[PDB]
């Protein structure tokens, strides 16, 4: 996918664009797991 690395290297907020670009309607979830990590 690279969505992992791309989003980690995505522009800080535009993980919006990258997640929802690569099908990740759960940018919500991408960040929420990243938050269970960073929560």
């Amino acid at each position: 996918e690279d969505v992992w690395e791309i989003l980690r290297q995505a522009p800080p907020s535009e993980y919006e664009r990258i997640a929802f670009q690569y099908g990740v309607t759960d940018l919500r979830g991408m960040l929420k797991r990243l938050k269970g990590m960073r929560r």
Partner: protein, 375 residues
């Protein structure tokens, strides 16, 4: 006894208030939005017989204790009710001090402001949370959608809106509510079954019936041929154990309850079905958003968990939409939590703590602060 804090993802799911934390994964709070009054007072030794522990126990006290939503119509008629509702939360199931954990606030549109005004200040004072912040339940699901473009159909705990959206971009003008609540379906169910040979009015009687819907009541895509099916279809002709121990028998209702959301005639409502609410919204949407919708036809609302939900959704939109365009309604199974989930996200969205309702900000601007450039 830990690091800075966890925001308090508290969600009064239109029927149940529910909550976890920021970054949480499951609302650790879930339970009825009712208050309960016993009647008789058999003179009973001792005490412990609360008037109003509804929370999640009172249904244990169902029958003697009556029922009270404060937000009855997604409309908080009373607050101290909801107040101790919160305290119950924060101190029995949240069993947690507000004062040190932030919280985002779940709300549907259409609320006269003072509702939030009051909720806000009192949350500070009674609660002194580090800071609060409100957010439209609708919007909350929206991010909970993450398909930042497209409408979402929010027919949830007991709520109903259409939420046209477009990479986060939603048109309130096109946005709408359907007063319908699974409670409403509940209603017509009582109507029918009772008149059909049943005497079913009591609060927890309503409890059983709502259980009935959410466990067995459904809808078939079609009606009229579906009607003929009903005319003799024995398979549906199934009795369910009434939790007295009776086995309530069931037929055409199991579906003839919800479907009226497309025809309030049955609720007699002047309104129109959810679907064409969607469709007139979309037509309101710009010329070619509509395909966006079609890919983004996000349903929301668990009580709508019934069969075929999309099945119809698509079929009628078809019946209305140009086959030119390709439709796709969107509805996760987990639509109850979805709203909670996206709220957990936003609040948990670290890059975003600037928004939370600070004690001070209120203080200087009182509650009215909340309104402009903030909610």
């Amino acid at each position: 006894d830990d690091e800075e804090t966890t925001a308090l993802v508290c969600d009064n799911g239109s029927g149940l208030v529910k909550a976890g934390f920021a970054g949480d994964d499951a609302p650790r709070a879930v339970f009825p939005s009712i208050v309960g009054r016993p009647r008789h007072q058999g003179v009973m030794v001792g005490m412990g017989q609360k008037d109003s522990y509804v929370g999640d126990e009172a249904q244990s006290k169902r029958g003697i204790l009556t029922l009270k939503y404060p937000i009855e119509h997604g409309i908080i008629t009373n607050w101290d009710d909801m107040e101790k509702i919160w305290h119950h939360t924060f101190y029995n199931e949240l069993r947690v001090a507000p004062e040190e954990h932030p919280t985002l606030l779940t709300e549907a549109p259409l609320n006269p402001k003072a509702n939030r005004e009051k909720m806000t200040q009192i949350m500070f004072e009674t609660f002194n949370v580090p800071a609060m912040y409100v957010a439209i339940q609708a919007v909350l699901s929206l991010y909970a959608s993450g398909r930042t473009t497209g409408i979402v159909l929010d027919s949830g705990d007991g709520v109903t809106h259409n939420v046209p959206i477009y990479e986060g971009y939603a048109l309130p003008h096109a946005i709408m509510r359907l007063d319908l609540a699974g409670r409403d379906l509940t209603d017509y169910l009582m109507k029918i079954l009772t008149e059909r040979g049943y005497s079913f009015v009591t609060t927890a009687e309503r409890e059983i019936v709502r259980d009935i819907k959410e466990k067995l009541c459904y809808v078939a895509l079609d009606f009229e041929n579906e009607m003929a099916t009903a005319a003799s279809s024995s398979s549906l002709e199934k009795s369910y154990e009434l939790p007295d121990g009776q086995v309530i028998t069931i037929g055409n209702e199991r579906f003839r309850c919800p479907e009226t959301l497309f025809q309030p005639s049955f609720i007699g409502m002047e309104s129109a079905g959810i679907h064409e609410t969607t469709y007139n919204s979309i037509m309101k949407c710009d010329i070619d958003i509509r395909k966006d919708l079609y890919a983004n036809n996000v349903l929301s609302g668990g009580t709508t968990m019934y069969p075929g939900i999309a099945d119809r959704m698509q079929k009628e939109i078809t019946a209305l939409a140009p086959s030119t365009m390709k439709i796709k309604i969107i509805a996760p199974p987990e639509r109850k939590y979805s709203v909670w989930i996206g709220g957990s996200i936003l609040a948990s969205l670290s890059t975003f703590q600037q928004m939370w309702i600070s004690k001070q900000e209120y203080d200087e601007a009182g509650p009215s602060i909340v309104h402009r450039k903030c909610f």
